[PDB]
Amino acid sequence: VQIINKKLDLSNVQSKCGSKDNIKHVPGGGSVQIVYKPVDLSKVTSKCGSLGNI
């Protein structure tokens, strides 16, 4: 047996925001789950001369 795994991210990013998840990885049944009026009001501005590799 030989197992090889390779996961590669070589991103260039000017503005990056992580996720906004409310009720996540919550096992077991028999419950009341309410996500009530979640709101995103956010403002993102990105301004650039150049971004990739040269």
Give the footprint of a copy of itself on this chain (CB under 8 A): 1-54
Q: What are phi and psi of 16, to 5 degrees?
A: -130, 130
* Contact indicator for 53, 11 with CB cutoff of 8 Å: no
Q: How far apart are CA 23 and CA 26, in angstroms?
A: 7
Minimum distance from residue 3 beta carbon to a copy of itself (Å): 5
Considering the complex, what minimum distance in angstroms separates the CB of residue 29 from a copy of itself? 2
| Shortest distance in whole angstroms from residue 10 CB to a copy of itself | 5
